[PDB]
Design a protein around this nucleic acid. Structure first.
Lengths: 217, 131, 99, 192, 119, 45
RNA sequence: AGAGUGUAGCUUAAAAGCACCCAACUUACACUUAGGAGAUUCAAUUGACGCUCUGA
């Protein structure tokens, strides 16, 4: 055949932080809380407060907010592990503690006669394995990483070839479970990039049509 | 009438039906009955995602065998500085679906996974002994 | 042995007057109703986006078959397989603050 | 002994293989719409329509009337879309629609109904009352000129004659007062 | 005159001279007064610019009410004062149809036909 | 993307008002849960 | 560079009928009730903007 059997990976780290609520969404969140309050009943806290208020009224004629104050003081003490990792990372797009609400896909800098640009991790089909197998040896032919990841299943996810006798590109997909890249100063420029920043590295047919299968939702 | 061309214009029991475990398809493939377990600490947010999962399966033409709830577990956390308490509850809703083609799996999974809500876990299992 | 909390506990009895203020305002009724209209439009747009990404992703996997039957049949025989290693699938939803 | 059906059988092109993967009607209403569409289909068996319907000739009832008014569909549609945009842009209209306190002016509705689709509604009323059958022996004409006829009853009263309302001979003792919107140079003929 | 008696195992009944049939599609409301022949006497729909240019929406409770008023006017001018309305239970318990029947009744149309002088 | 079924209220006829509560895990991750008392913050040991 | 072309998701529909979305009901679905958002790529059959397909 006048083609070359090459597979690739789409290793995506899941979003860790919840996406922020848009203007429209927050109005409902307030509204839904309002109607939840307006249609509830039997709060033990509220009953303790009301009953103690009435018994104190009897005693004054002749508690619970202290607990509320204590709770608020402890909550004011506790600081939250912040999610402004744009400030925690400046613009280091190679680290995995960049944009936490969104989704990042791996992208490494390579060199080739056609294009010396970034590629999704590549492999060639040896005559004794599956293409899922080819992505799984990409996992071990990257640059010293403890990427532990799940593979979404045994089927392709993209076919974006070029002619130079043809690099048939067989984009697969996987999902990062827990792993991390060793050697933070990796000489191979691995960059962890979103679909919105994909246009800083991927120009046309063989690499920029990957927006078909990079799911930003 | 039987001798006439209009015989059986009133059949209806061949249009209705009345009287599968680890199903496969050989060369092609299709998974068996799979349970989408969806536990959470919030009964509210769990129920909501189970509703979303059911509605998306119905829009995706995946057969849904049944939506059933696994028993709520109330666990008590005691910390001391006897100990005090903070009673917590985990509620679990399961969407039992039947026919998912092995090619479609990736898509369905990616989509339920991406939309997972804050604090609800998705554990898709095969119905063997979970009863 | 199936018992659940879909039942209402007996505790709920006769103290529901924490909110005896069912009386809304005309402006509140308008604001709530209009917000719900805007919710309906929003969620229609969201389902449009989700249907679009469904169609795009399936398009690609069917294009896979296309350009796998252009080349070779044995690779396709494994591209259609129940890979019985990924099924027990777990993923915990996104948390509010990072660890 | 059996005889093969003379044509297509009713529930024949439904695939009985994937009965559980075929879509079902879950609504009595949806079944009813399909039922009535088949009911109006021609059919090669004996039918209530065959024994009770009116079997008029398919002579394709000859028009004997003045040609249809010519309109510009694009300009009319653009005007109507802009008018609906303004009506929906009015906030009080949305308030009235949501509170169910809106209303529709019947007089304006009737005037532009007389201008737009009143001719065809009158034609159908005449055909139901069997006036073409008995006046022109089947030929139909769209009434394209609104012929306003009333009877002077009392001193300040009129009993209009629209499309089949009852007028007593006491109210019809003298001649009616008629008005047809016309141009000069057009001669006409009125007949009762 | 004969009313078509029978058909007492199916629905709707055909024992009427005229009938109000209302068709609520997704976008429009159409109400027709139809003879038992299937010939249509008088009709009112939101598909007309006649009702469109005054309504906000063509599928609301206001739409059903206004179609009720306009057909009531067309029925009185066509001489149709009586007809049968054959509803479904959910149509009967819906609020759009209550406003339509009220519009016809208060516009003059009586929604029960007189009986046949069989003798 | 994690908003779709996130916007939701308690869809029961008789139910107690549940307070918006942050629950840290053990690795220090908070999640918005609903609890009977206004304790704005609950720790998991 | 050249061809199939061109009504919102679909229609040997002509501004329609279904699909679709949110609330109430339902564990949920479904039904039902109330609401909702929409289309004719542009100039007097061709002419010139957008998708797909083919090649360099």
């Amino acid at each position: 055949s006048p083609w070359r059997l090459l597979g690739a990976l789409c290793l995506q780290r899941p979003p860790v932080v919840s996406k922020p609520l848009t203007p429209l969404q927050e109005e409902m969140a307030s509204l839904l809380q309002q109607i939840e309050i307006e249609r509830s009943l039997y709060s033990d806290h509220e009953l303790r407060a009301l009953d103690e208020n009435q018994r104190l009224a009897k005693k004054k004629a002749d508690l619970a907010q202290d607990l509320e104050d204590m709770w608020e003081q402890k909550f004011l003490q506790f600081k939250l592990g912040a999610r402004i990792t744009e400030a925690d990372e400046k613009n280091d797009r190679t680290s995995l503690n960049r944009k936490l609400d969104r989704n990042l896909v791996l992208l490494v800098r390579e060199k080739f006669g056609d294009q010396d640009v970034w590629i999704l991790p590549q492999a060639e089909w040896q005559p004794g394995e599956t293409l899922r197998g080819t992505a799984e040896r990409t996992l071990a032919t990257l640059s010293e990483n403890n990427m532990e990841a799940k593979f979404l299943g045994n089927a392709p996810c993209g076919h974006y070839t070029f002619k130079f006798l043809g690099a048939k590109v067989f984009f697969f997909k996987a999902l990062l479970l827990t792993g991390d890249f060793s050697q933070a100063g990796n000489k191979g420029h691995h960059v962890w990039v979103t679909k919105d920043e994909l246009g800083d590295y991927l120009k046309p047919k063989y690499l920029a049509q990957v927006r078909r299968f990079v799911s930003d939702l | 009438y039987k001798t006439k061309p209009t015989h059986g214009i009133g059949k209806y029991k061949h249009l209705i039906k009345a009287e599968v475990r680890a199903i496969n398809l050989g060369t092609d493939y299709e998974y068996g009955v799979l349970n989408i377990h969806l536990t959470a600490y919030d009964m509210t947010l769990a129920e909501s995602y189970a509703q979303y999962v059911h509605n998306l399966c119905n829009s995706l033409s995946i057969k849904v065998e049944e939506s059933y709830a696994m028993p709520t577990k109330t666990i008590e956390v005691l910390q001391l500085q006897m100990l005090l308490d903070s009673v917590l509850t985990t509620h679990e809703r399961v969407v039992q679906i039947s026919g998912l083609s092995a090619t479609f799996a990736e898509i369905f999974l990616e989509i339920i996974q991406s939309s997972l809500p804050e604090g609800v876990r998705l554990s898709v299992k095969e119905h063997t002994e979970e009863d | 042995i199936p018992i659940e909390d879909f039942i209402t506990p007996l505790k709920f009895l006769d103290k529901a007057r924490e909110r005896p203020q069912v009386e809304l305002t005309f402006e509140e009724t308008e604001r709530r109703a209009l917000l719900l209209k805007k919710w309906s439009l929003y969620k229609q747009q969201e389902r449009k986006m989700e249907r679009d990404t469904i169609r795009a992703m399936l398009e690609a996997q069917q294009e896979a078959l296309e350009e796998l039957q252009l080349e070779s049949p044995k690779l396709h025989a494994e591209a259609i397989k129940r890979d019985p290693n990924l099924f027990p699938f777990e993923k915990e939803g996104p948390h509010y603050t990072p660890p | 002994r059996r005889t093969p059906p003379l044509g297509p059988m009713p529930n024949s092109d439904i695939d009985l293989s994937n009965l559980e993967r075929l879509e079902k009607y879950r609504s009595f209403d949806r079944y009813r719409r399909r039922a009535e569409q088949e009911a109006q289909a021609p059919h090669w068996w004996r039918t209530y329509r065959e024994y009770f319907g009116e079997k008029t000739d398919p002579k394709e009832k000859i028009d004997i009337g003045l040609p249809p008014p010519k309109v510009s569909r694009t300009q009319q549609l653009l005007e109507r879309k802009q008018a609906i945009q303004e009506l929906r842009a009015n906030v009080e209209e949305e308030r009235a629609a949501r509170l169910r306190t809106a209303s529709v002016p019947l007089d304006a509705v009737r005037a532009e109904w007389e201008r737009t689709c009143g001719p065809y509604h009158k034609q159908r009323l005449a055909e139901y009352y069997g006036l073409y059958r008995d006046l022109f022996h089947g030929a139909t004409f769209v009434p394209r000129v609104p012929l306003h006829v009333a009877y002077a009853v009392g001193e300040d009263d009129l009993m209009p004659v629209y499309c089949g309302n009852e007028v007593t001979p006491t109210e019809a003792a003298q001649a009616p007062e008629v008005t047809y919107e016309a141009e000069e140079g057009s001669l006409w003929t009125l007949l009762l | 005159a004969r009313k078509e008696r029978g058909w007492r195992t199916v629905f709707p009944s055909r024992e009427f001279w005229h009938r109000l049939r209302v068709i609520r599609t997704q976008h429009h409301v159409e109400a027709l007064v139809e003879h038992q022949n299937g010939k249509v006497v008088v009709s009112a729909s939101t598909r007309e610019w006649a009702i469109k240019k005054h309504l906000y929406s063509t599928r609301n409770v206001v739409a059903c009410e206004s179609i009720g008023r306009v057909l009531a006017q067309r029925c009185l001018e066509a001489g149709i004062n009586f007809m049968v309305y054959q509803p479904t239970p959910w149509e009967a318990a819906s609020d759009s149809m209550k406003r339509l029947q009220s519009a016809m009744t208060e516009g003059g149309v009586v929604l029960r036909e007189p009986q046949r002088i069989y003798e | 993307d994690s908003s779709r079924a996130s916007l939701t209220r308690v869809h029961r006829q008789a139910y107690a008002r549940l307070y918006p509560v942050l629950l840290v895990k053990q690795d220090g991750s908070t999640i918005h849960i609903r609890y009977r008392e206004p304790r704005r913050m609950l720790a998991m040991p």
